[PDB]
Amino acid sequence: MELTPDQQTLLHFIMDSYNKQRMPQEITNKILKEAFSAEENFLILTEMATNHVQVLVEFTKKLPGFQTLDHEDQIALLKGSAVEAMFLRSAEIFNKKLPSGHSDLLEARIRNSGISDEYITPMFSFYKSIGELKMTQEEYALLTAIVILSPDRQYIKDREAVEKLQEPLLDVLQKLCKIHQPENPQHFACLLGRLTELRTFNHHHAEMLMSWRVNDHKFTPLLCEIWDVQ
């Protein structure tokens, strides 16, 4: 039911930390302004992803109790969640309301960005499923935090310590789903359902990057560490 004073504090703190990200307009204005080559689009992708990972590390460090975790587990959580968080943020940006015709042009411009056909349908299928859930900013923020604090990540030594940090975020999100969408009592389950779909992008992320219609696939040293490319 209603959020407690502790949960409201948690929610507002996660919101402020989440709001430090690059604005959706910065990305969409660039894409909608003019059509770029596959080469220019690969560079836009690479800089967007480098800024995303940097901001993600800062958001992750502020997560209550994250700094108390074992340093090797901290690296394993960051590495295991970076691609999923990126796709969750791109899904949020894709679904931000824009003037008439803009979302159709944005979709067509992403389709002709240089990415291989094979990866277009599962990516847009996920974006449209996120869109139908009519998620609030708070839901995206909490869901990102939950993705990062996933105990079921590979190489996690102490799963229980991670579970203790994720549980209060799941409790807040569940209350928010019951408050935002009382007509749909399947909303919380629906949201956790989307998280299971996010994980599939992890498997073929390297191939969707390498299949980009460019001659050279240049990645930054930070991207190489987090994406296991080069």
Partner: peptide, 12 residues
């Protein structure tokens, strides 16, 4: 050295 940049950003 496997996650050198990541370890650095995490510690800082």
């Amino acid at each position: 050295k496997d996650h050198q940049l990541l370890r650095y950003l995490l510690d800082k």
